[PDB]
């Protein structure tokens, strides 16, 4: 299925995923498509940061849903 991933500057990308993908798998797909290292990514849905070990289905994230990518800060 397709889901959208949006960044804080409103740029939107499209990702093909499976409902059974873990958020860890999704971060890797984002790396494959956009080059962003998984360790820099945080994905937000329904006001919560998603945990790497759970699935999109676990979070009720479904076709054409939007996840929000918030990169880790310099620090």
């Amino acid at each position: 299925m397709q889901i959208f991933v949006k960044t804080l500057t409103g740029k939107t990308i499209t990702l093909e995923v499976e409902p059974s993908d873990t958020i860890e798998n999704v971060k890797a797909k984002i790396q494959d498509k956009e080059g962003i290292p998984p360790d820099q990514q945080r994905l937000i849905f329904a006001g919560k940061q998603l945990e790497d070990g759970r699935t999109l289905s676990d979070y009720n994230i479904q076709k054409e849903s939007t996840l929000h990518l918030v990169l880790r800060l310099r620090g």
Binding site: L8, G10, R42, I44, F45, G47, Q49, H68, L73
Partner: protein, 198 residues
């Protein structure tokens, strides 16, 4: 309520006041024993609270009148002497400058006066007081935005509104989003980092 006779009389005094007739202050009953009241005050003109109305929780403690009524803003407000999270108030007459002969009308008008002029030397809310001193223009626009969102005042910054909308679209709670952006100089990156810290 041992002080009930006095609270009823002071209640009626506000009802009949000149300032109520000029729609500056007002009071309403909450409980049937007069131990809790609801006040309201108008934002003064030529402040960022203008056009807003602010509701106040007023609780009368068992030690009144030797100790002051406990007052907190129900209506959320951005002001150095009021908590941006709770509505708690830092004002001399509500703490150690209280005198037993002070009335409910005096307390209401002292609060309306506070909206006219902040006392940032003795703040309730360090984040707000810091902004008030360090960036008075952003403080003014931030206060006006809170007066629009919470107190009914006319429109504020469309750019602040769009930042609030953008973060609410991620599913964060609107009030949390407002206070995160207001506390972080309206910087979307750092307000979002605060929101993710809880």
């Amino acid at each position: 309520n041992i002080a009930v006779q006095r609270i009823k009389r002071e209640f009626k005094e506000v009802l009949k006041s000149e300032e109520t007739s000029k729609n500056q202050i007002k009071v309403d009953l909450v409980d049937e024993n007069f131990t809790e009241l609801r006040g309201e005050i108008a934002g003064p003109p030529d402040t960022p609270y203008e056009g807003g109305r602010y509701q106040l929780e007023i609780k009368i403690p068992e030690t009144y009148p030797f100790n002051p009524p406990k007052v907190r803003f129900i209506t959320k407000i951005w002001h150095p002497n009021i908590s941006s999270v709770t509505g708690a108030i830092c004002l001399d007459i509500l703490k150690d400058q209280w005198a037993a002969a002070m009335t409910l009308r005096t307390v209401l008008l002292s609060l309306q006066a506070l909206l006219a002029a902040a006392e940032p030397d003795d703040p309730q809310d360090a984040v707000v007081a810091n902004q008030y001193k360090q960036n008075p223009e952003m403080f003014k626009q931030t206060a006006r935005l809170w007066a629009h969102v919470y107190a009914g005042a006319p429109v504020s910054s469309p750019e602040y509104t769009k930042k609030i909308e953008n973060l609410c679209a991620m599913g964060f709670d609107r009030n949390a989003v407002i206070v995160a952006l207001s506390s972080k100089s309206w910087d979307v990156e750092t307000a979002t980092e605060l929101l993710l810290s809880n």
